[PDB]
């Protein structure tokens, strides 16, 4: 057994997802707007040869807001909608086809040196049956790297591996707002339309890995 060092490039690409559920009734009320895990598949090219990779994006530490426009059978409420802000995290899994990810079993140390990215939000229409429709638009946040975590599950003499990246968050210049309401000009990124009609987001950087490998 012997210790080695692996210094490679990395590009990670990801998305968001959501779920929107109404309540039963006359059609004026809404119960949930929340995040949901999403996954993506791509190929990119290092110095020598192309590599195919996978990601899975998730979230934690979620702030949840609400709106209550009275109590009648014909009024606009939102029971819960979620938003990501300073007290929250973004989790991204990553596993690759390359020769370097075969030696990520017995890891001594691991560091990563990525750069930041900004995610901004789009717009969403609340389609009431009768009347003008309120909209929810705006919001922005930026992502900064905060550590790497490896985990294993033990199931019948076979290990099941994962590699997760952490990202802390900081609010940015556009505020979000909900038209035809009193709710006024907050910061953070809601889950109405996170992707803003993009195919993916992108972060590039490098990492350094030290691990025990079996010596020939």
């Amino acid at each position, epitope marked *: 057994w012997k210790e080695m060092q692996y*210094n490679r490039d990395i590009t990670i690409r990801f998305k968001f997802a959501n779920t929107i559920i109404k309540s039963g009734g006359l059609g004026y009320k809404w119960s949930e707007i929340s995040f949901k895990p999403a996954n993506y598949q791509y190929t990119y090219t290092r110095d020598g040869e192309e590599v195919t990779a996978h990601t899975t994006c998730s979230v934690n530490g979620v702030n949840d807001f609400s709106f209550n426009g009275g109590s009648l059978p014909t009024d606009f409420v939102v029971s819960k909608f979620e938003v990501i802000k300073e007290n929250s995290y973004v989790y991204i899994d990553y596993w690759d086809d390359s020769q370097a990810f075969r030696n990520v079993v017995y890891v001594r140390s691991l*560091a990563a*040196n990525l*750069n930041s990215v*900004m995610c901004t939000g789009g717009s969403y229409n609340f389609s009431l049956p009768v009347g003008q429709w309120p909209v929810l638009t705006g919001g922005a946040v930026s992502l900064h790297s905060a550590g790497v975590t490896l985990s294993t599950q033990f199931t019948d003499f076979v290990s099941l591996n994962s590699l997760r990246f952490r990202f802390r968050l900081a609010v940015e210049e556009p505020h979000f707002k909900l038209t035809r309401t009193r709710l006024s000009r907050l910061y953070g990124l809601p889950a109405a339309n996170p992707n803003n009609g993009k195919e993916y987001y992108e972060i*590039a950087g490098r990492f*350094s890995l030290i691990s025990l490998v079996p010596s020939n």
Partner: antibody, heavy 114, light 107 residues
Framework: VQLKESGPGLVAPSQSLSITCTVS????????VHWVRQPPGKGLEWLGM???????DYNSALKSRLSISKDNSQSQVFLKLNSLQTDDAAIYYC???????????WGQGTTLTV | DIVMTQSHKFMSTSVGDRVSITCKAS??????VAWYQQKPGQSPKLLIS???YRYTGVPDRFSGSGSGTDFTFTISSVQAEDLAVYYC?????????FGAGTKLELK
């Protein structure tokens, strides 16, 4: 944060070089440091990088000459470069990494005559 | 080895007007270009980190834009202190590469 270079200033051909960059205001176990240079009448060129733990990247053309080490306790990082030619006359800088390759804070710089 | 090429080496401008400085890339660098400034007898200073994102202690008259391979750096109104040299860096791949350098001459 402050960075400060200190070098010989005059060296003969086919000799060595040693520059010491003493840092202040931050820790070397949290951040990572670069080295660059600028020849007269030419643009800037990248030389190397030392990581948080002991780990180095180098330039491909000058890989077989130079080496970078550091000391965490007495907060100072030093460079070496051997068997140098008359092309190597430049002003050497030590700078701090912030993001991926962004050079956040720069030093004063020492000049080399050969 | 992505090559960053600035087309000009000198710019002439007056005391209040617009200045624009450009540089191209050899490959596709997806919005990962920084900008620097070096006043006479100093060290360089970071101004724009990404292709548009300004830094904290930078005046409001500096800005930047661009995507793909073409990139710009603008000043809305000049002053007498803006006489320096400017650089465009790429921070997308493993060796970071600088541009040539464009001196600004105030007329």
């Amino acid at each position: 944060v402050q960075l400060k270079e200190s070098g010989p200033g005059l060296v003969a051909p086919s000799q060595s070089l040693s520059i010491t960059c003493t840092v202040s205001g931050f820790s070397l176990s949290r951040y990572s440091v670069h080295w660059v240079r600028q020849p007269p009448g030419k643009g800037l060129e990248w030389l190397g990088m030392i990581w948080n733990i002991g780990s180095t990247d180098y330039n491909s053309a000058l890989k077989s000459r130079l080496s970078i080490s550091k000391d965490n306790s007495q907060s100072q990082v030093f460079l070496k470069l051997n068997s140098l030619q008359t092309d190597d006359a430049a002003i050497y800088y030590c700078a701090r990494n912030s993001g991926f390759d962004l050079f956040d804070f720069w030093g004063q710089g020492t000049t080399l005559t050969v | 080895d992505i090559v960053m090429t600035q087309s000009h080496k000198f710019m002439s401008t007056s005391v209040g007007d617009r200045v624009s400085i450009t540089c191209k890339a050899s490959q596709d660098v997806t919005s990962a270009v920084a900008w620097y400034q070096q006043k006479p007898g100093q060290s360089p200073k970071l101004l724009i980190s990404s292709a548009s994102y300004r830094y904290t202690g930078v005046p409001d008259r500096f800005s930047g834009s661009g995507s793909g391979t073409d990139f710009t750096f603008t000043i809305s109104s000049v002053q007498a202190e803006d006489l320096a040299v400017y650089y465009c860096q790429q921070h997308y791949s493993t060796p970071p590469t600088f541009g040539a350098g464009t001196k600004l001459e105030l007329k």
